[PDB]
Nucleic acid binder design. Structure first.
Ligand code: MG
Ligand code: MG
Ligand code: MG
Ligand code: MG
Ligand code: MG
Ligand code: MG
Ligand code: MG
Ligand code: MG
Ligand code: MG
Ligand code: MG
Ligand code: MG
Ligand code: MG
Ligand code: MG
Ligand code: MG
Ligand code: MG
Ligand code: MG
Ligand code: MG
Ligand code: MG
Ligand code: MG
Ligand code: MG
Ligand code: MG
Ligand code: MG
Ligand code: MG
Ligand code: MG
Ligand code: MG
Ligand code: MG
Ligand code: MG
Ligand code: MG
Ligand code: MG
Ligand code: MG
Ligand code: MG
Ligand code: MG
Ligand code: MG
Ligand code: MG
Ligand code: MG
Ligand code: MG
Ligand code: MG
Ligand code: MG
Ligand code: MG
Ligand code: MG
Ligand code: MG
Ligand code: MG
Ligand code: MG
Ligand code: MG
Ligand code: MG
Ligand code: MG
Ligand code: MG
Ligand code: MG
Ligand code: MG
Ligand code: MG
Ligand code: MG
Ligand code: MG
Ligand code: MG
Ligand code: MG
Ligand code: MG
Ligand code: MG
Ligand code: MG
Lengths: 131, 228, 88, 180
RNA sequence: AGUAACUGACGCUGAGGAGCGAAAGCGUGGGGAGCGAACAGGAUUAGAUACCCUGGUAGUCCACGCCGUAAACGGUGGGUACUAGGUGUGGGUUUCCUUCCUUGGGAUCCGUGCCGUAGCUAACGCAUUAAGUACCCCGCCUGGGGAGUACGGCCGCAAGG
RNA sequence: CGGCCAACUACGUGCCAGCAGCCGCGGUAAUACGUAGGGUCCGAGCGUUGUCCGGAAUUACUGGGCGUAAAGAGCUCGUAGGUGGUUUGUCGCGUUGUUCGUGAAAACUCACAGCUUAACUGUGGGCGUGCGGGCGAUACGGGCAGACUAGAGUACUGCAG
């Protein structure tokens, strides 16, 4: 059954990237919303905005494409999942794409990016690797 | 910028497509709507793409580029041959030899052979050979002249390739991408858009639209030729 | 299968209100009436395995609903089980 | 000046009603040593024709390696053919650590420091295909930042910025020495 | 399938456990036209304890119990979300050329055939009813014989599993 | 000193006498057997033998598959366990948020220094990857303290099998 909204969101986004789609509609949640927020802040996605549906709120994400049509997203994968939950200390922050990617880490402040998280010295569970 | 007007295009029926049984879903963002199971091409993006094609062709002709004309359907053979022989530009209209542009060192020898045969025939020596081989050589003249029209005049290999009805003419565009030569072609409702670098929306199945598009591109080539 | 007359009688008579129908009380009431009636039928008809499948499915469904009632409120669970006179 | 190497020679055979017909196939890798890679697979009945075909095919098929100064930019997991070849850069002077076919193709590429491992199907052809795909998978920081629409300092680490600046200074010094 | 009145985290998969289950086989008591292991003859072959012909005993049928194995195959566990189409079939709601007859045209959900993109796969091939891209749990595999066998344990009256 | 694996020719017996870690080598003319030279490797050590890890992603958490190579149990119901569809509220028991507080000695890693340099040890750091209590946080990842419904179920009408 529907058992992992974050993985479902990541897979729908990367499936849309593979299928060259432009707009994706998903059920809205705080985790999805702020993950889209950090995606917008890093610039891998174009833009996001929330909407209203027949029942509850829904969020739409517009993919990013350039003049030469190559994908703006290379690949996504989740490391922390129900069951195998992986966590990182203050010194063992994961390195993704040789530091050219982004790991999403939930710290005491919130879902924040790995570089500034290491700058603060804070750490936590890694959501997914986006590169 | 454009030369052909909207009423002229509608009269020529350049907006039409095929039936619902042949269109590939890669034309969804080009198709506007469907009536009576027939798909229509989108005019404004058609104009943007033909404008981009005009810019590219004027650029390449101004810089001295060679563009080969490709078209084999029975309707457009006469039109392409006529316009190409008036503009003085190499063309292929009847038979596409596999990899003649890619494998050019092989067909260069037979261009040499055909020129030598023309030189020998123009001398007037026919009774010096047996009538059997005379008939054989006349037949091979017919065959090679009929199947080879453009390499007589191109020699120095092209810079761009222009194709009509790519789904049947996949060989030419495939060789073009394999060699890296830029591709300009007409994409119908059943054609792959990534195959053509500079697509030109239109119909390969209507002689009005085909003739008008060929005349427009020939006018662009003539303008560049005067502009050198 | 229950029909309109007795089924509306049951839904009203064990209903919390005169309009609610999907309440767990009415759901358990319908399941129990169905199981006793068709178990009486299967006491005569022995080898109806396709219907014993329905028995087992409806019974597991019932068990899930009773577990939900016990979880949400002990008092309502006890009242329901006492008013229907079952064991669990 | 091009670098030439041979990885494997095989005596392939064909059968007819008469008997056995032998044939020869060869695979070679060509490179300039600066980051330009070409692979060739050639078949013949004799080694000279085979190597000539391989060299011609390699000259036809080229590919460019975007290396940072002397090493690779980021680790790459090249999953292609039937083998898994995993490439990542290392500290300068560590050396190009790789198998046979990977060794040849990387040395023709001209890289000097790499860590590699082949995880299955040690066949040379599949290994070469996997390494070529791994190099294709490589991404360069400048146009990565261009795609992301974010400037270099906000994308790439200060350490690799320092390494790139040092590499650029060394290249400028070498160009000045060559000109003088 | 439609209205969506109501419940308001009740959902999923599920080690051990329990129930169903092709044909054949077994007990008891009946039935038994046709068919047909076993077994007799006739025929071929150097040879037939087979293929072929003539017969026909269990069984094949019924009721109650049993055994619980099949290339038990889609050789693919279930559930959920997403990802281009074309061509048939079945079931139901709607709307519009409207005769309002019409596989007329359109919208919608479920089931079931065929061909095909991108993608995956070593290949054949799969391709929204995925082997595509993922999430949750469960069983199974770690070179071929020995061997799915000996011993031990459990079930079965036994064959046996 | 056949290919793996840097190192070849002659002489002597030919399915014999023999080699050998995998493929594998002698059936009168062997770079694979024995002898000679010649060269290669190593060196006061040289090989054989046995145990252990790596390559073995060949037990795959990082990091494997189940169509045909090994594998989906015959299929369901379902107990214990594992996992949950939105947003409406505390304590902070899954958790990171900083600090003082342990981490015996020895060993490993960094720099220094002494035995003429060599093992050897001479001094001071550093290292000593875990765990104890006091002080400061609340985004995810649970119980607990209240409401709504996009999964699910019921309710009304029909439906084909
Ligand atoms: Mg009924
Ligand atoms: Mg893989
Ligand atoms: Mg392997
Ligand atoms: Mg190997
Ligand atoms: Mg209400
Ligand atoms: Mg269910
Ligand atoms: Mg379960
Ligand atoms: Mg369960
Ligand atoms: Mg169990
Ligand atoms: Mg079990
Ligand atoms: Mg039982
Ligand atoms: Mg039983
Ligand atoms: Mg039977
Ligand atoms: Mg039976
Ligand atoms: Mg018996
Ligand atoms: Mg019996
Ligand atoms: Mg009897
Ligand atoms: Mg009979
Ligand atoms: Mg018989
Ligand atoms: Mg008798
Ligand atoms: Mg007999
Ligand atoms: Mg079995
Ligand atoms: Mg079956
Ligand atoms: Mg199954
Ligand atoms: Mg599933
Ligand atoms: Mg459907
Ligand atoms: Mg493809
Ligand atoms: Mg492939
Ligand atoms: Mg398909
Ligand atoms: Mg599917
Ligand atoms: Mg698979
Ligand atoms: Mg045997
Ligand atoms: Mg076995
Ligand atoms: Mg035993
Ligand atoms: Mg040697
Ligand atoms: Mg050697
Ligand atoms: Mg000898
Ligand atoms: Mg020597
Ligand atoms: Mg070992
Ligand atoms: Mg994992
Ligand atoms: Mg494994
Ligand atoms: Mg198998
Ligand atoms: Mg199985
Ligand atoms: Mg089994
Ligand atoms: Mg529970
Ligand atoms: Mg605390
Ligand atoms: Mg503390
Ligand atoms: Mg401490
Ligand atoms: Mg100490
Ligand atoms: Mg060490
Ligand atoms: Mg000293
Ligand atoms: Mg020390
Ligand atoms: Mg350790
Ligand atoms: Mg819980
Ligand atoms: Mg309310
Ligand atoms: Mg509901
Ligand atoms: Mg019916």
């Amino acid at each position: 059954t529907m058992t992992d909204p974050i993985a479902d969101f990541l897979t729908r986004l990367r499936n849309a990237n593979s299928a060259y789609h432009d707009e994706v509609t998903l059920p809205h949640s705080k985790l999805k919303a702020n993950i889209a927020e950090i995606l917008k802040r890093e610039g891998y996605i174009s833009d996001y905005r929330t909407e209203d549906a027949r029942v509850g709120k829904s969020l739409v994400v517009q993919l990013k494409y350039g003049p030469s049509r190559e994908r703006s997203i290379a690949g996504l994968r989740r490391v922390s999942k129900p069951g195998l939950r992986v966590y990182a200390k203050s010194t063992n922050l994961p390195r993704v794409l040789g530091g050219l990617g982004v790991a999403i880490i939930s710290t005491s402040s919130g879902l924040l990016t790995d570089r500034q998280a290491a700058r603060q010295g804070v750490g936590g569970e890694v959501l997914a690797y986006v590169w | 910028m454009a030369v052909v007007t909207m009423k002229q295009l509608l009269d020529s029926g350049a907006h039409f497509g095929h039936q619902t049984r042949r269109w590939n879903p890669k034309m969804k963002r080009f198709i506007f709507t469907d009536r009576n199971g027939i798909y229509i091409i989108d005019l404004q993006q058609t104009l943007t793409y033909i404008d981009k094609a005009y810019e590219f062709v004027k650029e390449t002709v101004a810089h001295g580029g060679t563009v080969l004309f490709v078209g084999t359907k029975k309707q457009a053979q006469e039109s392409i041959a006529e316009e190409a022989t008036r503009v003085g530009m190499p063309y292929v209209n009847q038979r596409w030899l596999g990899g003649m542009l890619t494998n050019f060192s092989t067909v260069h020898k037979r261009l040499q052979r055909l020129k030598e045969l023309e030189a020998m025939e123009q001398t007037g020596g026919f009774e010096g050979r047996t009538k059997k081989e005379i008939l054989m050589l006349t037949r091979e003249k017919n065959k090679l002249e009929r199947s080879l029209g453009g390499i007589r005049d191109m020699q120095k290999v092209p810079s761009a390739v222009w194709v009509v009805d790519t789904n049947k003419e996949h060989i030419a565009v495939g060789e073009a991408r394999k060699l890296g030569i830029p591709v300009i072609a007409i994409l119908d409702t059943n054609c792959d858009p990534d195959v053509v670098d500079y697509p030109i929306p239109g119909n390969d199945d209507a002689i009005r639209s085909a003739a008008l598009l060929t005349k427009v591109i020939a006018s662009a080539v003539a303008e560049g030729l005067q502009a050198r | 299968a229950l029909t309109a007359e007795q089924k509306k009688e049951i839904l009203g008579q064990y209903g919390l209100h005169d309009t609610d129908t999907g309440s767990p009380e009415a759901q358990v009431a319908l399941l129990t009436k169905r199981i006793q009636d068709l178990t009486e039928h299967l006491k005569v008809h022995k080898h109806d395995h396709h219907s014993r499948r329905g028995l087992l499915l409806l019974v597991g469904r019932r068990r899930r609903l009773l577990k939900y009632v016990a979880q949400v409120d002990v008092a309502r669970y006890r009242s329901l089980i006492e008013r229907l006179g079952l064991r669990r | 000046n091009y670098i030439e190497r041979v990885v494997s020679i095989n005596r392939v055979s064909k059968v007819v009603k008469g008997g056995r017909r032998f044939s020869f196939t060869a695979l070679v890798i060509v490179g300039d040593g600066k980051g330009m890679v070409g692979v060739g697979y050639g078949k013949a009945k004799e080694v000279p024709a085979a190597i000539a075909k391989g060299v011609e095919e390699a000259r036809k098929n080229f590919f460019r390696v975007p290396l940072i100064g002397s090493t690779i930019t980021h680790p790459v997991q090249g999953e292609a053919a039937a083998g898994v070849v995993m490439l990542r850069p290392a500290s300068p002077g560590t050396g190009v650590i790789a198998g046979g076919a990977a060794r040849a193709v990387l040395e023709c590429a001209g890289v000097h420091d790499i860590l590699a491992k082949s995880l299955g199907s040690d066949n040379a052809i599949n290994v070469v295909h996997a390494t070529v795909a791994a190099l294709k998978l490589l991404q360069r920081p400048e146009e990565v930042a261009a795609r992301r629409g974010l400037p270099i300092e906000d994308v790439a680490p200060a350490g690799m910025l320092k390494a790139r600046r040092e590499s650029e200074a060394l290249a400028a010094a070498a160009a000045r020495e060559g000109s003088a």
